[PDB]
């Protein structure tokens, strides 16, 4: 496995009202950033990733404009949140 | 009171299910969704989600969006509403 186990935790159970620094790839300077635009649950980034109807491209993109993340950092929450989905939605 | 409609959309994970599998979305209502890019129950999900669940603005977007009366937009927001608190 080449997950965190940051991801593998997120991934093995619903999310709930967990905040959005439980998301892979959002440390505690992007999640500020996400909250102070009201993207404070986990789930609120979610409900983004399903309206960019789960494309990556679209997703990172969003990120980058709205916390300042870098590529690694978007792609390791794209895909915590894509294997969630596989497994709950 | 809910419709066997919204029973069986509550019951289970959504996967890809058209948006029409929501209470409420019946025909006309499906395609006007799918025309502005809501063609699956989970982008709709995904609005629920984005608007942090609150039922008055989720259900005057849906009226904005697709046109849904008062009882179509109740029966959306609630199947919507009870499906996160069983699987999210």
Redesign the interface.
């Known amino acids: 496995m080449t997950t965190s186990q940051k991801h593998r935790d997120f991934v093995a159970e619903?999310?709930?009202e967990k905040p959005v620094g439980s998301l892979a790839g959002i440390g505690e300077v992007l999640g500020k950033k996400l909250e102070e635009r009201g993207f404070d649950?986990a789930?609120?980034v979610?409900?983004?990733?399903?309206?960019?109807?789960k494309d990556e491209d679209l997703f990172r993109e969003w990120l980058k404009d709205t916390c300042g993340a870098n590529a690694k950092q978007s792609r390791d929450c794209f895909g915590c949140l894509r294997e969630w989905?596989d497994a709950?939605?």
Do not use: A, E, N, S
């Open positions: 619903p999310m709930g649950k789930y609120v979610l409900g983004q990733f399903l309206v960019l109807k989905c709950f939605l």
